[PDB]
Design a binder for this molecule. Structure first.
Ligand SMILES: Cc1nn(-c2ccnc(Nc3ccc4c(cnn4C)c3)n2)cc1CN1CC(O)C1
Length: 266
């Protein structure tokens, strides 16, 4: 639990997320602060659950939580990733090249390999939830929907969902509300499609029910313009319909290593 007197917030928004500076032992640390807007119950509990997940995670490709601050509002204080969301960055930086995008999605795969090993399911793995420290260093963010798996199960059973997250959901999430590291792999495939499409939205112009129907017919998003063929092939493997045959992150990470080195050594 952090001291509000040592935290300064900048006025404008990145409830809300604001840039701040937290006075540590001696130096200031630049932070991003998730601030809960609560004019006037369960909103507080969601923020604390998000914090509880981040507290348990320690990996270079995951956003680090500094702590929680209880003051005028409830606040989740994190280490600042200066460049912000991957989708918005790639939208505004079309100059970014194949190898660089491959480097970044590989880093995400390394963070997700760690999450998988820790038996946590992200449940919201999308390009908007990858933050850039630098142009060559990505971290996974946004653990608000994340769940610690039971010791005796490899999935979490959710309640009925709305329309907004559907485009990143695996068929078993849609049909059975079952979330696993394998469903995170499906989402990662969509994340890759986003990244190599320079932050364009997946399944443009389609409703969730239409996406679900498309996937049930055995159809998948086409190759983004200019996207390396081997990356498109990996997306399709991530979009393996049945959970058992779909790869885990260890496998996805390994195939990202090898092609990264192929591109570096071409
Ligand atoms: C939970 C959370 N942490 N968090 C963080 C955590 C650490 N760093 C940053 N840095 C950062 C830097 C520049 C930014 C943004 C957003 N827009 N811009 C221009 C974020 N954000 C952001 C969020 C909100 N999610 C980011 C997803 O897009 C929504």
């Amino acid at each position: 639990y952090l001291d509000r007197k040592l935290l300064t917030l900048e006025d404008k928004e990145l409830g809300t997320v604001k840039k701040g500076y937290y006075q540590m032992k001696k130096v200031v640390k630049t932070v991003a602060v998730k601030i809960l807007k609560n004019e006037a119950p369960a909103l507080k509990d969601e923020l604390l659950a998000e914090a509880n997940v981040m507290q348990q995670l320690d990996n270079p490709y995951i956003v680090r939580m500094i702590g929680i601050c209880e003051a005028e509002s409830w606040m989740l204080v994190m280490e600042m990733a200066e460049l912000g969301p991957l989708n918005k960055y790639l939208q505004q930086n079309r100059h970014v090249k194949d190898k660089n995008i491959i480097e970044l999605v590989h880093q995400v795969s390394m963070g997700m390999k760690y999450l998988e090993e820790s038996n946590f399911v992200h449940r919201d793995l999308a390009a908007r939830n990858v933050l850039l420290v630098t142009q060559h260093y990505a971290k996974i963010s946004d653990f608000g929907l994340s769940k610690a798996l039971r010791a005796d199960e490899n999935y979490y059973k959710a309640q009925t969902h709305g329309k907004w997250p559907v485009k990143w959901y695996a068929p078993e999430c849609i049909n059975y509300y079952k979330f696993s590291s394998k469903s995170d792999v499906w989402s990662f495939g969509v994340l890759m499609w986003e990244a190599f499409s320079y932050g364009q939205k997946p399944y443009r112009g389609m409703k969730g029910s239409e996406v679900t129907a498309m996937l049930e017919k055995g159809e998948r998003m086409g190759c983004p313009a200019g996207c390396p063929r081997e990356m498109y092939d990996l997306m399709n493997l991530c979009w393996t319909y049945d959970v058992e045959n779909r790869p885990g992150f260890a496998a996805v990470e390994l195939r990202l290593r090898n092609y990264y080195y192929d591109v570096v050594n071409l």
